[PDB]
Ligand binder design. Structure first.
Ligand SMILES: *[C@@H]1O[C@H](CO)[C@@H](O)[C@H](O)[C@H]1NC(C)=O
Ligand SMILES: *[C@@H]1O[C@H](CO)[C@@H](O)[C@H](O)[C@H]1NC(C)=O
Ligand SMILES: *[C@@H]1O[C@H](CO)[C@@H](O)[C@H](O)[C@H]1NC(C)=O
Lengths: 101, 97
């Protein structure tokens, strides 16, 4: 229904992760990604946090997807997608970063 | 260069939160609440609490109004300026009963 859906992601240190938040049924209602520190990454199609590694895969009413390139072990953690229905709905994607053997 | 200030409001009253940037190009401002929920991202409303309104948004100022305040609204609101790296200024909202 009108609920944000995300999945856990696993990526190798140095590789590129893609975090995807989807909504089955939606209008206008805005989506937003934040990082483990709760800082905003994108608000719909508008970049927030300047970090040149974080870029926009897709922004629409049904999808908000972002790529983190050249990931490091310190990107590991819980990312949150928020959809601004009243009350707000959230869904978490835990990003795991594997070291190179 | 984000600059905000502590604000006092009597319970049931309306508080205004103002964030100021002395010189700015086209870098974004965002207010968020003590839970860290985004309220306004520039002129774009986020959290849907219909008590929260936009007073003013431009590159030099982001101001929002909280009408009808309650005791649970008390605390640290943060203004963010998305420079590289990000800069923040907190305003503390005191609500008296
Ligand atoms: C996603 O990751 C967290 C990491 O601890 C975990 O609790 C959760 O179960 C994971 N999702 C699953 C198992 O579907
Ligand atoms: C989307 O458009 C509506 C019209 O119903 C506009 O008034 C409103 O601000 C937007 N609503 C959102 C973002 O929830
Ligand atoms: C704003 O409020 C907090 C905590 O009550 C305080 O630490 C800060 O100094 C305050 N602002 C002033 C004194 O202007």
């Amino acid at each position: 229904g009108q609920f944000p859906l995300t999945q856990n992601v696993t990526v190798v240190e140095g590789g590129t992760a893609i975090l995807t938040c989807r909504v089955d049924q939606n209008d206008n209602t805005s989506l937003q990604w934040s990082n483990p520190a709760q800082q905003t990454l994108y608000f719909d199609d508008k970049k927030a946090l300047r970090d040149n590694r974080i870029e926009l895969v897709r922004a629409s009413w049904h999808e908000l997807s972002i790529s983190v390139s050249d990931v490091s072990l310190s990107d590991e953690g819980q990312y949150t997608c928020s959809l601004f229905t009243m009350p707000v709905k959230t869904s978490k994607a835990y990003l795991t970063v594997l070291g190179v053997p």
